[PDB]
Amino acid sequence: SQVFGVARIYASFNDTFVHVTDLSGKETIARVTGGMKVKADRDESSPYAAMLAAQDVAAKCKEVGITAVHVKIRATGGTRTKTPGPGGQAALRALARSGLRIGRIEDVTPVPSDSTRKKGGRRGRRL
Amino acid sequence: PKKRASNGRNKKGRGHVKPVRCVNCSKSIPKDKAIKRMAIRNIVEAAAVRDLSEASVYPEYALPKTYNKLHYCVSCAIHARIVRVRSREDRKNRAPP
Amino acid sequence: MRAKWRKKRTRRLKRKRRKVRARSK
Amino acid sequence: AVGKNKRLSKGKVVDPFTRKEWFDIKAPSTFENRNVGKTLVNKSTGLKSASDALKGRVVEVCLADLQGSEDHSFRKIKLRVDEVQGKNLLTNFHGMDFTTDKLRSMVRKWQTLIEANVTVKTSDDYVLRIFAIAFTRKQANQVKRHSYAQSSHIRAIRKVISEILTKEVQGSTLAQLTSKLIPEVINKEIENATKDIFPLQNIHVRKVKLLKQPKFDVGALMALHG
Amino acid sequence: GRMHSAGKGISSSAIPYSRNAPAWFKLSSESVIEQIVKYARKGLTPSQIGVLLRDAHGVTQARVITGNKIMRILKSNGLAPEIPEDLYYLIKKAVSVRKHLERNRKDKDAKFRLILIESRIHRLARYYRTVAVLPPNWKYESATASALVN
Amino acid sequence: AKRTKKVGITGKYGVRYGSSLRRQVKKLEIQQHARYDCSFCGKKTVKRGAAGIWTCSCCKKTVAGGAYTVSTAAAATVRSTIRRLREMVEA
Amino acid sequence: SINQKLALVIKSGKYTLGYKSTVKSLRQGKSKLIIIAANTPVLRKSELEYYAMLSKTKVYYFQGGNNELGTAVGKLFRVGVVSILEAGDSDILTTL
Amino acid sequence: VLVQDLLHPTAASEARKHKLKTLVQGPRSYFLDVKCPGCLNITTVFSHAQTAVTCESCSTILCTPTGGKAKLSEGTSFRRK
RNA sequence: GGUGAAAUUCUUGGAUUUAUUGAAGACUAACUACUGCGAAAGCAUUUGCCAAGGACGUUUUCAUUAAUCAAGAACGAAAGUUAGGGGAUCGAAGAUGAUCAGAUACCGUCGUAGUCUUAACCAUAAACUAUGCCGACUAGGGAUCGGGUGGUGUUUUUUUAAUGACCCACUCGGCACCUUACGAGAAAUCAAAGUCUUUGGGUUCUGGGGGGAGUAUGGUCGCAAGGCUGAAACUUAAAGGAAUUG
Ligand SMILES: [Mg+2]
Ligand SMILES: [Mg+2]
Ligand SMILES: [Mg+2]
Ligand SMILES: [Mg+2]
Ligand SMILES: [Mg+2]
Ligand SMILES: [Mg+2]
Ligand SMILES: [Mg+2]
Ligand SMILES: [Mg+2]
Ligand SMILES: [Mg+2]
Ligand SMILES: [Mg+2]
Ligand SMILES: [Mg+2]
Ligand SMILES: [Mg+2]
Ligand SMILES: [Mg+2]
Ligand SMILES: [Mg+2]
Ligand SMILES: [Mg+2]
Ligand SMILES: [Mg+2]
Ligand SMILES: [Zn+2]
């Protein structure tokens, strides 16, 4: 009765990622980023830019035919901060209000098992 | 003169404690010296919660959580409005809020 | 100055003195 | 950052969705639901034969979806599609996994966690690697505030867990094991086998990862989709 | 004091105040003396001699049950070992550990403990030499250690 | 008596040919001449015949080994690898 | 282990060492058991096995070379095989 | 306290305290007389055996060693001595 | 992409990204705490193998066999050196972008040696608890780890037993902590830094204002970088510790 997609919201620092894919993941759809919607290079993570991206990707998803979506929120991951960028929450809100259908929200930020090495040196980024 | 009975760490009977790395400034720091914090926050917000609930299939679905461990250098923790200072005798206080 | 740099400078000076001494014997 | 491209070409329009068509996805028998979802691929040209590109696609699905009840909220299962039959691709099992949020809630200090693994061989000549996780209790009437283990009891428990997984997987082919883990009868058996040693609550098993595959054997695959 | 460690633990016997006065055993002395020599002909050391007298039989301690001590009796009957039991066990310890080193080149900890063992060996050798129970000029050496054990 | 301090075997080279070179040649010549184990006949009775050869005067068997040693590190590793692969494949 | 069993054999019972002696003993059947070192020539080992099956005598394959077999049997030289005449006080015959 | 007799302190305190630190030290062990199940063969056994002493008549088992007091067999009748 | 902001750099040859496969080396997360082990430096994935150790229990043995130590030895972080292997990541030298009057620095991006291992060296650190080792005595408090004792104590096994896990009580030996100060100190503080003008339990080592200086020189070790030993001339009235008000 319903047709799903995969959202895979990536909320990084100094940028923001949005792109819906096929449930298998090989067929990608409606890849919209913060930078492609702005000219500040300050705002590619801004909640406003993320909201613009969310509305645009939502419209594209609606016209291609996918009605609902499964949320995988994912941060910078790897060895890095693992905290989501500011814009991601605003983008998720915007896509929820844009009209689409939502189910099965999860978190998929990648955490390592005591990884190799952080950059920055012993005495760390200092400023 | 000595400032701290523990010298500002938690090493008694070890000698070496295999340091870890600052989350913010990436500086190295021994584990016991760290200013370790736990962040337990729900995924979405307390503001968008109504929106997602009213627009959620499987009504009252899960609203899952998030758990992060945070490690800071001394200077990061101080400048991050975390543990700012306490007075001389107040320093001795151990209990958390 | 900082004692580490003091000792660094003095070590360099010792090396210079040693080689200038060895130049003749 | 729209105007930041000083060069877009190293050296120096068509809508891609019209060439794309939908295909339905099907689960095996050992679940109460069978419908899975729909997937997109280009026209299966005389060069591509989209069935070929779809031979080995992978998906992930929640078990609460497969059995309705939100009790199996976390319970991930990933599925490899293996046979396409007229827009109705057929799937086969590829792995069980637990969820981050639940599992990283499972861990709290002032207790002992224990983990173990095994690399059993199935009757279907599959090689399956299984992980087991445990946390103790602070029993009732306990006064001490952390209630840890003694690191030799841990040895005994890990040995027992290992040999129990070995026994409970060997002899069994695959589907009986799937029908054991969906009602987690082995998860139930663990504390029966270990209660006299130490409390050990939350004996959820772990993700399970396949390692080696025998011949394809379309016949039993279709037998699953009956 | 744990002369080669930092331990201060104390764990030992505290024999009762009553010295020569059980006065409640039927068993006579000779019985136990020939029992001891019966064990000795099987090649047991006074440690387990006392242990088995204490467990299998009712024997509080040979010094009160008999009129003397176990090694005194063994010396009287001519079954005294050529070297004292403690030193013999130490030399066994040393040969075993060094044989372990031969395969284990990098076990610097084992090498370390080897010095402690050989040191206590040498000091006891000195003590026995000055009490004139070992032949003066008696010397322990790594080469002859394995053979001198057995 | 300790005839010489550290030149050891390479004392035959006098004062020529350089310190580091002479040291390295010492380090190799020691192995190049010492004994090893005729593990077949179980004793200390093997010598180099030429490059890579090793002959056991007892048991008469000659083993092709490293150019300066009975077995090299590479040889040990590869033999272990072969053993491992054989067991894993047959099992 | 087994080494202490052999030591008990040496101190209590009767035995013999060496290929010639062992085959001689096995020839009249005075042997109860033979122990064969690992690195012995395989031809010789097979011959001893054939003699053993011919004389209905048990055989045990040591896990090591003749050198350390010598140490285990508590002599100083190397020994190829050993023959156990009388166990004397050991359990080797009964066990294994 | 500042005044109290060391000569005659209470036996309650004595049993309370460690064996080596009493006013005069004394062992806390004892002997048992045990009847091997079946064959009578009353045997004298130390409290903390350290060895698995067993009856001459039928050598089944009497006591197993342990870090504390020896643990006796199931069907056994023992008497403090 | 990156910051504060830009910028160097990758992208229509499809960058950034998504999915399935595969390889490489490094590490052993989250559990992890005023908790464990080791002489110390140090030691956190499994299993097996090799040997070692403390405490506990002990109506076993020896009988004074001991304590600390010039001379003399073992181990000894990281960095560094020699010769192979390995050589992902990070990353002194260096390259480049940005700020500044200048910036060979902090900030950006790459980037040799090194970062891992093997066989040898090298013997240093805030190697810190800036508190030598052994023995005796002197105030309480709870908590915790390991062994031990008693308890009709709870839980479950087979109600039940033995267990094991618990709870209570006691004890030995650990890492600590809390309260007080008769006592100590100049104070900060301290159950040892106490039992010292009422000046004596045993013993090793070190210091005699600050600089000159851990330099010169002489031996000695090392291939070297350097280590160990180690002055004087001359110069100076203050340097310094802890606390108080500003
Ligand atoms: Mg200060
Ligand atoms: Mg340290
Ligand atoms: Mg001492
Ligand atoms: Mg003492
Ligand atoms: Mg691409
Ligand atoms: Mg781990
Ligand atoms: Mg622990
Ligand atoms: Mg002394
Ligand atoms: Mg120093
Ligand atoms: Mg003292
Ligand atoms: Mg205890
Ligand atoms: Mg304790
Ligand atoms: Mg402690
Ligand atoms: Mg002076
Ligand atoms: Mg002076
Ligand atoms: Mg001051
Ligand atoms: Zn040969």
Side-chain angles (χ1 to χ4, degrees), chain A residues 1-21 25 28-127, chain B, chain C residues 1-24, chain D, chain E, chain F, chain G, chain H:
Chain A
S1 54
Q2 205 66 261
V3 65
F4 286 168
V6 164
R8 267 160 176 205
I9 303 99
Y10 172 33
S12 178
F13 263 79
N14 200 359
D15 209 321
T16 300
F17 279 59
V18 184
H19 73 90
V20 62
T21 66
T28 81
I29 297 169
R31 188 208 265 194
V32 63
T33 62
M36 63 206 307
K37 299 291 218 49
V38 310
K39 66 184 289 184
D41 186 74
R42 275 62 140 191
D43 292 331
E44 46 189 358
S45 178
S46 65
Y48 182 75
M51 182 278 288
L52 275 71
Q55 298 172 346
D56 198 328
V57 65
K60 184 68 179 294
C61 176
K62 179 203 59 45
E63 62 86 20
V64 65
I66 301 299
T67 300
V69 71
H70 282 319
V71 176
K72 290 185 183 292
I73 184 64
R74 189 269 299 165
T76 304
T79 70
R80 295 186 141 253
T81 71
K82 297 176 178 63
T83 187
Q89 192 69 207
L92 183 63
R93 254 181 61 91
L95 67 86
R97 313 301 101 171
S98 181
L100 282 72
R101 182 64 270 171
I102 297 89
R104 290 284 144 91
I105 298 171
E106 299 92 7
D107 178 35
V108 291
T109 300
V111 55
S113 62
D114 215 356
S115 58
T116 81
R117 182 95 192 190
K118 217 168 174 295
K119 83 170 291 294
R122 168 156 197 135
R123 190 172 62 189
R125 215 176 94 78
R126 54 161 151 271
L127 75 165
Chain B
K2 185 182 289 293
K3 197 161 181 159
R4 294 181 184 271
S6 71
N7 313 296
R9 50 196 295 198
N10 224 317
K11 190 194 69 84
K12 283 305 216 321
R14 274 151 204 65
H16 190 264
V17 177
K18 196 73 66 63
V20 304
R21 208 68 166 265
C22 182
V23 176
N24 189 326
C25 75
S26 70
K27 164 180 198 94
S28 177
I29 191 167
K31 181 164 181 210
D32 72 317
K33 194 152 181 223
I35 192 163
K36 305 172 41 43
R37 303 287 88 185
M38 191 56 28
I40 297 169
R41 297 284 75 78
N42 50 351
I43 293 173
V44 298
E45 262 192 35
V49 61
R50 205 196 63 64
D51 291 331
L52 276 298
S53 65
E54 67 80 23
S56 70
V57 303
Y58 293 101
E60 310 296 328
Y61 158 61
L63 193 150
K65 284 272 211 63
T66 62
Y67 316 120
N68 297 357
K69 195 172 221 163
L70 277 296
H71 295 88
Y72 307 82
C73 76
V74 176
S75 187
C76 288
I78 291 165
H79 190 65
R81 274 311 271 151
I82 301 299
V83 298
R84 59 206 72 79
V85 293
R86 294 91 61 71
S87 69
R88 176 147 177 287
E89 78 285 17
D90 189 359
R91 264 171 201 150
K92 272 187 258 187
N93 189 358
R94 195 56 155 271
Chain C
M1 65 184 73
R2 188 173 151 169
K4 185 183 286 185
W5 318 129
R6 281 290 292 169
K7 168 168 208 180
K8 183 149 178 310
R9 172 187 287 195
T10 302
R11 277 191 189 172
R12 283 181 170 162
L13 197 64
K14 290 174 70 175
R15 201 151 58 205
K16 194 175 305 324
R17 287 210 293 265
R18 206 153 69 224
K19 72 182 294 184
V20 71
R21 207 182 153 191
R23 192 181 186 179
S24 302
Chain D
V2 289
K4 279 281 203 224
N5 282 315
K6 301 288 97 175
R7 60 89 173 174
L8 173 150
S9 52
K10 160 187 178 167
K12 274 62 62 182
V13 291
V14 175
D15 174 329
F17 307 82
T18 65
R19 63 183 42 66
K20 206 150 295 305
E21 49 271 36
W22 273 246
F23 287 80
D24 165 25
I25 301 299
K26 185 173 296 299
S29 66
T30 59
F31 294 107
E32 74 183 14
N33 292 38
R34 299 296 302 275
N35 83 336
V36 178
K38 214 158 295 182
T39 187
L40 276 300
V41 71
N42 265 9
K43 299 294 187 291
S44 72
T45 76
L47 290 81
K48 186 200 61 163
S49 71
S51 81
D52 291 331
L54 272 63
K55 294 312 330 183
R57 303 300 210 62
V58 177
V59 298
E60 174 262 324
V61 65
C62 168
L63 193 50
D65 291 331
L66 294 174
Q67 274 72 18
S69 64
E70 270 287 4
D71 62 358
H72 322 97
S73 161
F74 62 95
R75 316 287 314 241
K76 272 159 304 194
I77 297 89
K78 64 182 181 293
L79 278 297
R80 65 182 181 179
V81 61
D82 281 328
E83 187 59 33
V84 192
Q85 289 298 31
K87 326 287 277 161
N88 296 115
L89 291 72
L90 285 74
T91 61
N92 176 279
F93 178 73
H94 200 295
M96 183 177 176
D97 189 358
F98 283 60
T99 60
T100 62
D101 53 348
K102 182 267 289 181
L103 183 62
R104 64 180 176 88
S105 65
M106 295 298 102
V107 57
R108 326 193 81 63
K109 58 187 174 71
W110 288 310
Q111 62 194 327
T112 61
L113 188 151
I114 296 173
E115 207 186 1
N117 70 346
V118 71
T119 300
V120 194
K121 183 68 178 295
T122 70
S123 315
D124 297 331
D125 288 333
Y126 276 119
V127 178
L128 264 292
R129 204 201 301 241
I130 308 144
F131 312 130
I133 183 170
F135 305 75
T136 55
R137 280 85 67 192
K138 184 210 150 73
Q139 291 179 177
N141 81 12
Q142 283 283 30
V143 297
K144 64 162 51 183
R145 295 179 67 250
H146 49 67
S147 81
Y148 289 115
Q150 215 184 1
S151 178
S152 64
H153 302 105
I154 297 169
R155 184 141 41 260
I157 297 169
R158 277 181 316 114
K159 178 173 167 323
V160 169
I161 297 169
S162 63
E163 61 86 20
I164 297 304
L165 276 296
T166 61
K167 182 63 69 177
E168 298 294 329
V169 174
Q170 65 183 177
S172 293
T173 66
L174 61 86
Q176 72 300 329
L177 291 173
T178 64
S179 66
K180 298 206 195 61
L181 55 89
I182 301 299
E184 62 269 4
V185 307
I186 301 299
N187 274 270
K188 185 54 211 73
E189 194 279 336
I190 301 299
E191 74 274 15
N192 296 115
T194 187
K195 67 97 176 175
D196 50 338
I197 298 317
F198 210 70
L200 277 297
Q201 62 84 30
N202 175 10
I203 316 302
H204 295 89
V205 57
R206 293 281 320 310
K207 71 176 284 187
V208 60
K209 164 190 315 178
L210 61 83
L211 297 179
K212 177 259 161 195
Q213 180 180 0
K215 191 70 176 67
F216 189 82
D217 189 75
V218 182
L221 178 142
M222 281 285 178
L224 264 72
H225 293 222
Chain E
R2 304 297 78 80
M3 65 180 288
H4 294 89
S5 190
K8 280 73 176 175
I10 62 170
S11 299
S12 66
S13 293
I15 62 170
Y17 180 29
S18 173
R19 187 190 300 285
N20 64 7
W24 69 279
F25 291 166
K26 319 304 180 316
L27 277 296
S28 179
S29 57
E30 293 82 3
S31 62
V32 298
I33 296 89
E34 292 83 4
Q35 183 54 290
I36 297 169
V37 303
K38 185 282 161 193
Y39 284 75
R41 303 331 191 71
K42 323 214 302 204
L44 294 174
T45 62
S47 179
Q48 56 265 16
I49 301 299
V51 175
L52 277 296
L53 294 174
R54 194 251 291 281
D55 273 17
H57 303 197
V59 176
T60 67
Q61 65 183 357
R63 187 267 182 275
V64 65
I65 301 299
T66 61
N68 301 116
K69 295 179 287 297
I70 297 89
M71 293 178 70
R72 187 95 90 182
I73 301 299
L74 277 296
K75 194 282 181 193
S76 66
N77 85 356
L79 281 293
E82 71 280 25
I83 62 170
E85 295 77 1
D86 50 1
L87 183 58
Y88 176 94
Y89 275 90
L90 294 174
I91 307 168
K92 274 173 41 43
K93 194 62 151 73
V95 298
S96 65
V97 65
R98 194 201 280 81
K99 185 177 180 180
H100 162 90
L101 282 72
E102 321 315 337
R103 284 161 281 310
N104 293 103
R105 189 79 277 169
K106 314 322 281 303
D107 214 318
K108 305 213 203 274
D109 190 2
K111 174 176 213 180
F112 182 76
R113 310 267 154 180
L114 182 62
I115 297 89
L116 295 174
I117 297 169
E118 293 179 353
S119 167
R120 67 184 68 188
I121 297 169
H122 292 113
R123 314 161 61 130
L124 294 174
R126 192 195 324 295
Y127 166 61
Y128 284 111
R129 194 146 54 268
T130 185
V131 303
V133 65
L134 294 174
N137 65 7
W138 194 105
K139 174 172 281 283
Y140 159 71
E141 321 85 350
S142 166
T144 77
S146 164
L148 183 63
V149 173
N150 276 117
Chain F
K2 276 293 299 312
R3 311 200 204 70
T4 187
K5 280 174 63 66
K6 65 179 73 174
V7 65
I9 190 167
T10 61
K12 64 162 151 273
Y13 292 124
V15 298
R16 321 175 290 246
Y17 293 160
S19 311
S20 58
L21 299 204
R22 191 167 63 245
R23 266 220 299 269
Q24 188 176 3
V25 159
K26 184 203 201 73
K27 168 174 154 291
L28 288 175
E29 279 209 21
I30 301 299
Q31 313 144 310
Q32 203 273 0
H33 290 88
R35 294 321 181 61
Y36 294 98
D37 299 334
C38 183
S39 71
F40 293 164
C41 55
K43 44 204 179 307
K44 300 294 187 291
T45 61
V46 291
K47 297 291 180 70
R48 194 181 174 281
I53 314 300
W54 303 105
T55 61
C56 191
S57 64
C58 170
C59 182
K60 277 73 69 177
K61 304 182 91 83
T62 74
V63 166
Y68 293 62
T69 300
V70 176
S71 66
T72 61
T77 61
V78 65
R79 184 181 320 81
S80 66
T81 300
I82 300 299
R83 204 201 50 51
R84 194 271 301 301
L85 279 193
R86 185 177 65 247
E87 321 275 20
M88 186 275 288
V89 65
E90 53 83 17
Chain G
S1 174
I2 308 314
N3 302 49
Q4 75 280 18
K5 284 168 161 282
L6 282 72
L8 173 53
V9 176
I10 301 299
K11 68 179 288 186
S12 168
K14 291 174 70 175
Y15 69 91
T16 187
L17 296 172
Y19 175 79
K20 304 172 91 203
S21 67
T22 186
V23 65
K24 204 182 91 53
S25 83
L26 183 62
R27 183 177 292 171
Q28 322 100 328
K30 334 302 281 193
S31 163
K32 306 311 211 304
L33 165 68
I34 62 170
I35 279 161
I36 298 195
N39 74 24
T40 186
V42 298
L43 158 69
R44 184 181 301 261
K45 182 175 73 175
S46 66
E47 181 198 14
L48 292 184
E49 293 179 354
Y50 182 76
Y51 265 108
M53 75 88 86
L54 183 62
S55 174
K56 318 287 198 45
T57 64
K58 274 192 291 323
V59 65
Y60 174 38
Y61 294 98
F62 187 81
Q63 296 294 321
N66 54 82
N67 263 356
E68 69 275 16
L69 188 68
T71 61
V73 65
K75 299 298 293 295
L76 206 52
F77 44 89
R78 65 197 50 101
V79 295
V81 310
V82 304
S83 178
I84 301 299
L85 276 296
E86 311 325 329
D89 273 318
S90 284
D91 292 331
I92 296 174
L93 277 297
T94 62
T95 189
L96 60 91
Chain H
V1 179
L2 279 295
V3 161
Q4 62 84 30
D5 74 313
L6 294 174
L7 294 174
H8 313 297
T10 187
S13 57
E14 312 325 329
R16 184 176 177 87
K17 292 165 73 70
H18 179 275
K19 64 154 151 166
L20 284 175
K21 295 190 182 297
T22 61
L23 180 60
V24 162
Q25 65 183 177
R28 214 81 71 191
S29 72
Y30 53 107
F31 279 166
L32 294 174
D33 310 69
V34 176
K35 188 270 177 179
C36 171
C39 53
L40 277 296
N41 297 105
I42 303 310
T43 49
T44 62
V45 176
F46 181 76
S47 313
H48 300 84
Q50 302 159 356
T51 64
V53 69
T54 304
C55 177
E56 60 88 22
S57 63
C58 71
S59 66
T60 303
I61 193 66
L62 276 296
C63 295
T64 61
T66 305
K69 283 186 282 188
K71 204 152 191 213
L72 308 92
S73 303
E74 190 277 331
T76 50
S77 66
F78 64 90
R79 281 81 65 193
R80 274 261 301 171
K81 180 140 63 177

